[PDB]
Swiss-Prot record, chain A:
Induction: Expression is directly activated by NR1H2 and NR1H3. Expression is not dependent of the sterol-response element-binding proteins (SREBPs). Expression is indirectly induced by LDL. The gene is MYLIP. Changing residue 20 to A: Abolishes ubiquitin ligase activity. E3 ubiquitin-protein ligase that mediates ubiquitination and subsequent proteasomal degradation of myosin regulatory light chain (MRLC), LDLR, VLDLR and LRP8. Activity depends on E2 enzymes of the UBE2D family. Proteasomal degradation of MRLC leads to inhibit neurite outgrowth in presence of NGF by counteracting the stabilization of MRLC by saposin-like protein (CNPY2/MSAP) and reducing CNPY2-stimulated neurite outgrowth. Acts as a sterol-dependent inhibitor of cellular cholesterol uptake by mediating ubiquitination and subsequent degradation of LDLR. Residues 64-66 are annotated as: Critical for homodimerization. Autoubiquitinated. Homodimer. Interacts with the E2 ubiquitin-conjugating enzyme, UBE2D1 (via RING-type zinc finger). Interacts with myosin regulatory light chain (MRLC) and TMEM4. A zinc finger (RING-type) spans 20-55. It is found in: Cytoplasm; Cell membrane. The RING domain mediates ubiquitination and the neurite outgrowth inhibitory activity. The FERM domain binds phospholipids and mediates lipoprotein receptors recognition at the plasma membrane through their cytoplasmic tails. The chain holds residues 369 to 440 of 445 of the full protein. Ubiquitously expressed. This is E3 ubiquitin-protein ligase MYLIP.
Length: 73, 69
């Protein structure tokens, strides 16, 4: 029905919000510290000297284990 | 249809996974450091000495801003 399409769109937008804001390909699993923006995968986060959301300097990157994480398994 | 029901179930399970493992009411927005488990809201994380997932000592709690917030 039309509601199937609406639900597919909601699911797609939620899954998109879980992907890296830089590469759009890998899951978010890293936090820029100390600002706390958690918007990148580990590969993009390692390459950024400033947070891409707030431009605060990145002192270090904290890996985050989230309950929503998925994998080929 | 039955497909609408399947999608509703997937959405519900994803939204449930975003809620605090202790209170089940507030969104997760805190990380235990240094282990990195990000499973609690700020209020529940504040009082724990050890990670509720892996038992590692909690040196500090980092607030996290997630795109779903
Ligand atoms: C409140 O948000 C969450 C809670 C728990 C697990 C993940 C999320 C999330 N939101 N965006 C991403 N990338 O993960
Ligand atoms: Zn990335
Ligand atoms: Zn930031
Ligand atoms: Zn809580
Ligand atoms: Zn832990």
């Amino acid at each position: 029905s039309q509601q199937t399409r609406v639900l597919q769109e909601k699911l797609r937008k939620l899954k998109e919000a879980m992907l890296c804001m830089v590469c759009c390909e890998e899951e978010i699993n890293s936090t820029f510290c100390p600002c706390g923006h958690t918007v990148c995968c580990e590969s993009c986060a390692a390459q950024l000297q400033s947070c891409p959301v707030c431009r605060s300097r990145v002192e270090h990157v904290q890996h985050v284990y989230l309950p929503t994480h998925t994998s080929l398994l």
